[PDB]
Protein backbone atom coordinates (compact mmCIF):
# COMPACT_ATOMS: atom_id res chain seq x y z
CA UNK A 1 0.00 0.00 0.00
CA UNK A 2 0.84 3.51 -0.55
CA UNK A 3 -1.45 5.35 2.06
CA UNK A 4 -0.13 8.87 1.61
CA UNK A 5 -1.41 8.31 -2.05
CA UNK A 6 -4.81 7.27 -0.72
CA UNK A 7 -5.67 9.23 1.92
CA UNK A 8 -4.80 12.22 -0.78
CA UNK A 9 -6.78 11.05 -3.20
CA UNK A 10 -9.87 10.23 -0.64
CA UNK A 11 -9.48 14.06 0.24
CA UNK A 12 -9.00 15.22 -2.71
CA UNK A 13 -11.77 13.37 -4.75
CA UNK A 14 -14.45 13.97 -2.01
CA UNK A 15 -13.50 17.65 -2.04
CA UNK A 16 -13.97 18.35 -5.59
CA UNK A 17 -16.87 16.27 -6.25
CA UNK A 18 -19.04 17.66 -3.09
CA UNK A 19 -17.56 20.90 -4.43
CA UNK A 20 -19.77 20.09 -7.98
CA UNK A 21 -22.44 18.16 -6.69
CA UNK A 22 -23.64 20.78 -4.62
CA UNK A 23 -22.94 18.79 -1.44
CA UNK A 24 -21.73 16.83 0.41
CA UNK A 25 -9.19 8.08 9.23
CA UNK A 26 -10.00 11.17 11.92
CA UNK A 27 -6.89 12.65 9.73
CA UNK A 28 -8.90 12.79 6.49
CA UNK A 29 -12.04 14.02 7.98
CA UNK A 30 -10.00 17.70 9.79
CA UNK A 31 -7.87 17.52 6.50
CA UNK A 32 -11.57 18.08 4.55
CA UNK A 33 -13.04 20.41 6.64
CA UNK A 34 -9.84 22.58 6.82
CA UNK A 35 -10.11 22.62 2.95
CA UNK A 36 -13.28 23.66 2.67
CA UNK A 37 -12.54 27.19 4.68
CA UNK A 38 -9.07 27.50 2.87
CA UNK A 39 -10.29 26.14 -0.22
CA UNK A 40 -13.33 28.48 -0.83
CA UNK A 41 -11.43 31.23 0.55
CA UNK A 42 -8.66 30.83 -2.13
CA UNK A 43 -11.05 30.19 -4.90
CA UNK A 44 -13.12 33.35 -4.13
CA UNK A 45 -9.87 35.46 -4.01
CA UNK A 46 -7.90 33.99 -7.23
CA UNK A 47 -11.38 33.99 -9.24
CA UNK A 48 -10.09 36.48 -12.10
CA UNK A 49 -7.14 34.43 -12.07
CA UNK A 50 -8.84 31.07 -11.87
CA UNK A 51 -11.58 31.83 -14.63
CA UNK A 52 -8.41 33.38 -16.67
CA UNK A 53 -6.91 29.87 -16.52
CA UNK A 54 -10.20 27.67 -16.85
CA UNK A 55 -10.71 29.11 -19.91
CA UNK A 56 -7.52 29.51 -21.43
CA UNK A 57 -7.54 25.87 -21.01
CA UNK A 58 -11.06 25.24 -22.29
CA UNK A 59 -12.23 21.89 -20.88
CA UNK A 60 -14.77 20.06 -22.81
CA UNK A 61 -14.86 16.84 -22.36
CA UNK A 62 -12.37 13.37 -20.48
CA UNK A 63 -9.42 13.57 -23.34
CA UNK A 64 -9.39 17.44 -22.25
CA UNK A 65 -8.66 16.30 -18.77
CA UNK A 66 -6.25 13.59 -19.39
CA UNK A 67 -4.37 16.26 -21.10
CA UNK A 68 -4.27 18.39 -18.13
CA UNK A 69 -1.38 16.48 -16.55
CA UNK A 70 1.80 18.54 -17.30
CA UNK A 71 0.86 22.05 -17.97
CA UNK A 72 -0.48 20.92 -13.94
CA UNK A 73 3.25 19.93 -13.29
CA UNK A 74 4.04 23.34 -15.39
CA UNK A 75 2.34 25.47 -13.09
CA UNK A 76 2.92 23.94 -9.87
CA UNK A 77 6.53 22.71 -9.69
CA UNK A 78 8.50 25.99 -8.71
CA UNK A 79 10.66 24.19 -6.16
CA UNK A 80 9.71 26.44 -3.17
CA UNK A 81 7.38 24.02 -2.15
CA UNK A 82 4.74 24.96 0.94
CA UNK A 83 0.95 24.33 1.69
CA UNK A 84 -0.27 27.51 0.02
CA UNK A 85 0.41 26.49 -3.36
CA UNK A 86 -0.64 22.77 -2.75
CA UNK A 87 -4.07 24.23 -1.19
CA UNK A 88 -4.21 26.35 -4.30
CA UNK A 89 -3.60 23.45 -6.76
CA UNK A 90 -6.89 21.76 -4.72
CA UNK A 91 -8.91 24.77 -4.90
CA UNK A 92 -8.55 25.73 -8.50
CA UNK A 93 -9.60 22.04 -8.92
CA UNK A 94 -12.64 22.55 -7.37
CA UNK A 95 -13.10 25.95 -9.74
CA UNK A 96 -12.96 23.40 -12.54
CA UNK A 97 -14.89 20.61 -11.24
CA UNK A 98 -18.11 22.72 -11.02
CA UNK A 99 -17.21 24.00 -14.15
CA UNK A 100 -17.63 20.67 -15.43
CA UNK A 101 -21.03 19.94 -13.80
CA UNK A 102 -22.34 23.41 -15.08
CA UNK A 103 -21.34 21.66 -18.79
CA UNK A 104 -23.29 18.22 -17.58
CA UNK A 105 -19.55 16.30 -17.31
CA UNK A 106 -19.61 15.15 -13.75
CA UNK A 107 -17.72 11.85 -15.19
CA UNK A 108 -14.61 14.06 -15.54
CA UNK A 109 -14.69 14.92 -11.99
CA UNK A 110 -12.64 11.48 -10.61
CA UNK A 111 -10.16 11.53 -13.35
CA UNK A 112 -9.57 15.37 -12.46
CA UNK A 113 -9.20 14.44 -9.16
CA UNK A 114 -6.78 11.18 -9.80
CA UNK A 115 -4.48 13.50 -12.06
CA UNK A 116 -4.19 16.05 -9.00
CA UNK A 117 -3.19 13.64 -6.20
CA UNK A 118 -1.01 12.06 -9.08
CA UNK A 119 0.80 15.60 -9.70
CA UNK A 120 1.02 16.30 -5.96
CA UNK A 121 2.22 13.01 -4.54
CA UNK A 122 4.41 12.41 -7.20
CA UNK A 123 6.67 16.00 -7.25
CA UNK A 124 6.42 16.90 -3.33
CA UNK A 125 6.34 13.20 -1.58
CA UNK A 126 9.32 13.88 -0.10
CA UNK A 127 8.27 17.65 1.12
CA UNK A 128 4.84 16.00 2.20
CA UNK A 129 6.48 13.50 4.38
CA UNK A 130 8.66 16.06 6.05
CA UNK A 131 5.74 17.80 7.25
CA UNK A 132 3.61 14.40 8.77
CA UNK A 133 1.44 14.43 5.34
CA UNK A 134 -1.97 15.71 5.74
CA UNK A 135 -1.75 16.23 9.65
CA UNK A 136 1.20 18.76 9.12
CA UNK A 137 -1.89 20.34 6.42
CA UNK A 138 -4.17 20.00 8.64
CA UNK A 139 -2.35 21.95 11.63
CA UNK A 140 -1.09 24.32 9.33
CA UNK A 141 -4.19 25.77 9.07
CA UNK A 142 -5.35 25.70 12.75
C1 LIG B 1 -6.40 21.43 -11.27
C2 LIG B 1 -5.20 22.27 -11.69
C3 LIG B 1 -4.41 22.98 -10.62
C4 LIG B 1 -3.22 23.84 -11.00
O1 LIG B 1 -2.52 24.46 -9.98
C5 LIG B 1 -1.51 25.31 -10.41
C6 LIG B 1 -0.85 25.86 -9.15
C7 LIG B 1 -1.86 26.65 -8.33
C8 LIG B 1 -2.09 28.00 -8.99
C9 LIG B 1 -1.42 29.18 -8.73
C10 LIG B 1 -0.30 29.51 -7.80
O2 LIG B 1 0.36 28.71 -7.23
N1 LIG B 1 -0.11 30.93 -7.77
S1 LIG B 1 1.09 31.63 -6.82
O3 LIG B 1 2.43 31.30 -7.32
O4 LIG B 1 0.99 33.10 -6.90
C11 LIG B 1 0.80 31.06 -5.14
C12 LIG B 1 1.80 30.17 -4.44
C13 LIG B 1 1.46 29.74 -3.01
C14 LIG B 1 0.17 30.17 -2.33
C15 LIG B 1 -0.81 31.06 -3.06
C16 LIG B 1 -0.48 31.50 -4.48
N2 LIG B 1 -1.91 30.18 -9.51
C17 LIG B 1 -2.90 29.65 -10.27
C18 LIG B 1 -3.81 30.34 -11.33
C19 LIG B 1 -4.83 29.50 -12.02
C20 LIG B 1 -4.99 28.06 -11.71
C21 LIG B 1 -4.10 27.43 -10.68
C22 LIG B 1 -3.02 28.30 -9.96
C23 LIG B 1 -2.82 24.02 -12.44
C24 LIG B 1 -3.62 23.32 -13.51
C25 LIG B 1 -3.26 23.46 -14.99
C26 LIG B 1 -4.79 22.45 -13.14
CL1 LIG B 1 -5.68 21.66 -14.47
Redesign the pocket.
Known sequence: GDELYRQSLEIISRYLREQATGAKGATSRKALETLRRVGDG?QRN?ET??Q??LRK?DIKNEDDVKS?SR??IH??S?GVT?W??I???IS??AF?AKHLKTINQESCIEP?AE??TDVLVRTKRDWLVKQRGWDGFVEFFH
Open positions: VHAFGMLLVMVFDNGRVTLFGVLSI
